[PDB]
Amino acid sequence: MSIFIGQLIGFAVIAFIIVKWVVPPVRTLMRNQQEAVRAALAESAEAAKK
């Protein structure tokens, strides 16, 4: 059990680290990527309107 508890606490620490410092950037980079996809997807549509 002691080994399990120790490795679980380590996993929790690394999970917190990634969620507080690695998740935010990946999240927002993806956010911007998708937002730009959106913008361009649209463009096409509107230029077809023009």
The footprint of other proteins (CB under 8 A) covers 1-14, 17-18, 30, 33-34, 37-38, 41
Q: How far is the CB of 46 from other proteins (least distance, A)?
A: 15
Minimum Å distance from CB 9 to other proteins? 4
Shortest distance in whole angstroms from residue 41 CB to other proteins: 7
Assigned token pair, 41: 């997807």
Give the position of tokens 């080994």. 3
Helix (H, G, I), strand (E, B) or coil at 25: helix
